[PDB]
Design a protein around this ligand. Sequence first.
Ligand SMILES: Cc1ncc(COP(=O)(O)O)c(CNCCc2ccc(O)c(O)c2)c1O
Ligand SMILES: Cc1ncc(COP(=O)(O)O)c(CNCCc2ccc(O)c(O)c2)c1O
Ligand SMILES: [Mg+2]
Ligand SMILES: [Mg+2]
Lengths: 601, 601
Amino acid sequence: KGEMNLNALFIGDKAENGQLYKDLLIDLVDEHLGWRQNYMPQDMPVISSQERTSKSYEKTVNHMKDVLNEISSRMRTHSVPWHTAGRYWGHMNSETLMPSLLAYNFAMLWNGNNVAYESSPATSQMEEEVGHEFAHLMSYKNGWGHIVADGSLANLEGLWYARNIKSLPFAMKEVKPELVAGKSDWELLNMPTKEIMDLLESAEDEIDEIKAHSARSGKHLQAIGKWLVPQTKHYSWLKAADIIGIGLDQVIPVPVDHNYRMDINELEKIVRGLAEEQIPVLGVVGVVGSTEEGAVDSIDKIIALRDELMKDGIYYYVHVDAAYGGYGRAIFLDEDNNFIPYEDLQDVHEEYGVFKEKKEHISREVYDAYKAIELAESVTIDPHAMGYIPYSAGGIVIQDIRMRDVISYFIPALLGAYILEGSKAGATAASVWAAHHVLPLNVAGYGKLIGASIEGSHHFYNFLNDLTFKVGDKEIEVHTLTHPDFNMVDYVFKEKGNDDLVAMNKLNHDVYDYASYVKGNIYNNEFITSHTDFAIPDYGNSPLKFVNSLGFSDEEWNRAGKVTVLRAAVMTPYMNDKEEFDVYAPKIQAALQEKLEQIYD
Amino acid sequence: KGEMNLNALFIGDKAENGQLYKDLLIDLVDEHLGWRQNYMPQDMPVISSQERTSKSYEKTVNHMKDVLNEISSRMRTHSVPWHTAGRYWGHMNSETLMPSLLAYNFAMLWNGNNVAYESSPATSQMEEEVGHEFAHLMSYKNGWGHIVADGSLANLEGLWYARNIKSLPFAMKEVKPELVAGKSDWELLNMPTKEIMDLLESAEDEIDEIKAHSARSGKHLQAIGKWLVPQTKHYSWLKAADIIGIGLDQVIPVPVDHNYRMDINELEKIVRGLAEEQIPVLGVVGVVGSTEEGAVDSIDKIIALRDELMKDGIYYYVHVDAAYGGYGRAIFLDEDNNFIPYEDLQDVHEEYGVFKEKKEHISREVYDAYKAIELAESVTIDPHAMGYIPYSAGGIVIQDIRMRDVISYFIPALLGAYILEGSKAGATAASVWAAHHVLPLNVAGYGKLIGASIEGSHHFYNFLNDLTFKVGDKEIEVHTLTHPDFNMVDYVFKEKGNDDLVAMNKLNHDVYDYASYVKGNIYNNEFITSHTDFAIPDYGNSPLKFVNSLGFSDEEWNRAGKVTVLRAAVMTPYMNDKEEFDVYAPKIQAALQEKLEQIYD
Ligand SMILES: Cc1ncc(COP(=O)(O)O)c(CNCCc2ccc(O)c(O)c2)c1O
Ligand SMILES: Cc1ncc(COP(=O)(O)O)c(CNCCc2ccc(O)c(O)c2)c1O
Ligand SMILES: [Mg+2]
Ligand SMILES: [Mg+2]
């Protein structure tokens, strides 16, 4: 039964459900104040009745009102209207799920600390469950997970896992070489991750000593190997190296295709090349849902190469960075957590309400990529991304629960023993738990929400291709960068006969200026988007096919050095129906017209 | 004018101000829904009237209600009643400030991302100000700061600063040795931090290259030196080494006194000893407000030694870990941000309402320690500690704004360039900003809140000393560990004639069991506290004077190996008046009596 109305789980583009929120809000608030009053009910209120009616109180209350009135003016002047159903087409931001907003404020009134069960016996039991729901979303059979502060710190917590794991073999040589007897110092730096715990767990009475000689000691950080990341990586990855101690100098970027997914052949060249030079590979990162392109790296083809190289004695750790796309894997899961066969996807999506038109919306490349995330050792998934949970809430999931003992310090009692950070809000766990439990992590819940964002991005794609604008005696047309592998549709504007790639980049960068906070009050902006510069230094000639299809030469490309593209991670849940989009399409067009008519007069 | 009622800035032990909260809550909510409706007011609500009255909606709304009703049952069964005015005497948890709770929920409805101004043009302008308010709280003249996820990640961000800074000299040798010409490879690893930027800023066109050869490269992580921390350190510090790459093996614990503050003489022995062996010192951490003892390390005496050793060619970075105590430095600041002279403290505290009895409440040791934090390079301050802001919100403050260029990547535009983490809630900034602006960070605001927690801890101290309990034909008495240097009062229970330190530890650890979530429903617990085990491995014979004053020999001490103490970081704002405490004292005593009468029958 796809009978869930997603339009009820949101306050609304025009606050249509504002009464629902306020009623559920005050109903939850009143339940908390009642708990308080009934804790030791023999206790008399300390704040007297006469004090609550005194001038001391009024002057203090009237100042809180004045401070909140200042906060309100500033929030209502500068904040971004990404609640609009179809005028915000930019960053990874729309509305957030009402069940999470309500459960956060409700839980914040108890202000539990998840670092220790004794300061959160209930929100910590939620995060335990939230952790298993993450693992089952990844089809891990004995995995685990927890809520991270943000995705950048979950990528770091992953590299922490890797960095420590590559070093464990060497350390079992120095502490109990009976575990790695007969193993060359290259065989040690290329052991599969499953073998390492199966050994680490074997040495029961020595786990603690073995870990003391790990990378936790501070040594073997240049021996563990190089970190391989897509050329289109997030800065979290460059900084993660800096902090973990591998170094930004030991980070190798693997070139990307013209779909801006890692070239699996260029990946091979590098891994084999490094082993001929006898340098190990600490790990590779597969990006399911890129930052500026919305690209899904082929996890299926990364773990394939690893399975082929594992016969030539070369193993790599795979960490999937699904900060954006992690929650989209529920669109692939049935109500039993079994992965829908591709042949039955369009059919099942139609019976559950995931998609409104029974077409192909997802590729077998993206489907198989998502399915192979189950064979990687850790994944980064951000609830404050495609989970529709408010900031600040990220996630990390590990394939094997035992893997947390490689970073462990001394329910998971102090769950801060098995995490990188420390104090955590139990209210952030309640907001995630609530979302996962109102919206199941399969096609009966989040599947429908992910699907509305995807289908809404596809209407945006076809709307942009057909777009042409006559501004004066000029004719500007809009070009899409690539076919969306998820919900991010990228686009550029170009003068019909202008072979200047420098000028095309000044058109797009002026459109951003008028469709952002830069030019004008944003409360009067009828269209808002994002901008990104793809530059040869960090992207290569990956954007050359596209720039060439627009009339640009490899000489103008190598001159300008960058193509400025406009980004639209479509996360609106109100643009799945073509009829609703067709209502806001004329409004996006009337805005982009007037914006273009203002940078040319 | 100390005319601020702090009893209005809290919901209340018995929800006395619950209407105030609900009224201000719904008033702020309605202001947000109005902004939304007036963004592009020509737009028609997409959720139809007929849909909001359809069965699809009801069934989905009725399930959200069912999920929230489950969350509510679990939160109202297991959460801890630290709202009570005088029955919770344990962890660093009481109520939170109403202005922050309101401003967080208000700002969460916009869900801005502080990693980039374009996704938070208002909550990022608040965090900029929140950052300067941190720096002025530390009497920095050209400092900076920002909100961290938690204190453990702010300690790490500090060590990141240090780790990179010690390495900069070596790197200016490899990139522009004209900056460090004539400087021995020991003089480089012992340059004062001010000299390093004054040089780093001098090399304008080479900053980026110089940083590429820093610890960011991955090299010189064992050359930068050893990290010195108090024996009574937080685990954040052990883990910070692991992650930053210095190693848990390059961490030297400096022994603590019997006041459990670093022995400044034992500190000297180590620093000079290390330089005779030619090992540099990466930095020392001074703990203003310890975890289990509430101890304030002598910052005044740490920066003194550094000023004396800086003539023998030995410099150390000082980072103050004031996660707990950071906000208590406002009790020392007048309304002009000038540090009150100790001679005038009791007087000024009486005219502003900070203390209710004109006694001495703070020592010149703690006063001068707080005042010398101004000469350390970075400080960790947690709003979710003595700032009374709800989780999750920590802080880091740096003495020199330019110091952020040593970790910088590419208003502070992307403030995520000058931070360790990434995505941040702008709502966490609004809750901190609101608190700082309802409660000024001097004696006219937070001074009064800190003072009520201190004075409330002192009544707890004198209440425990005089405490004796006749349980059966036995007589148990209560002993305080040390005189509170802040708001944490520690205590032990002991059988009058029992020379067993093992048994005394089983009395206290059984009291914890009955005064915690362990034994019984916590909604029927009339007293809740915390427990900690001070063990020779990590504390030394620091607890020997105390264990000796109770009738224990150095042989029973060395046998048991640990003393179990009960911890009470008194953060209640309702125990400053002796009359109010004297109302809850009989209730703490009746509870501890019945608890003791249950572990002995
Ligand atoms: C694939 C991938 N991994 C990690 C990150 C960073 O995750 P964080 O949660 O931010 O730590 C990202 C990029 N995420 C961009 C998030 C974002 C959201 C709103 C904004 O306004 C801005 O500027 C950025 C990623 O793609
Ligand atoms: C001096 C000092 N520095 C850092 C920390 C850790 O800071 P975090 O904000 O937690 O990252 C601490 C210890 N803080 C204990 C915090 C706390 C609060 C509520 C609880 O229920 C528990 O268990 C812990 C510190 O003292
Ligand atoms: Mg640009
Ligand atoms: Mg114990």
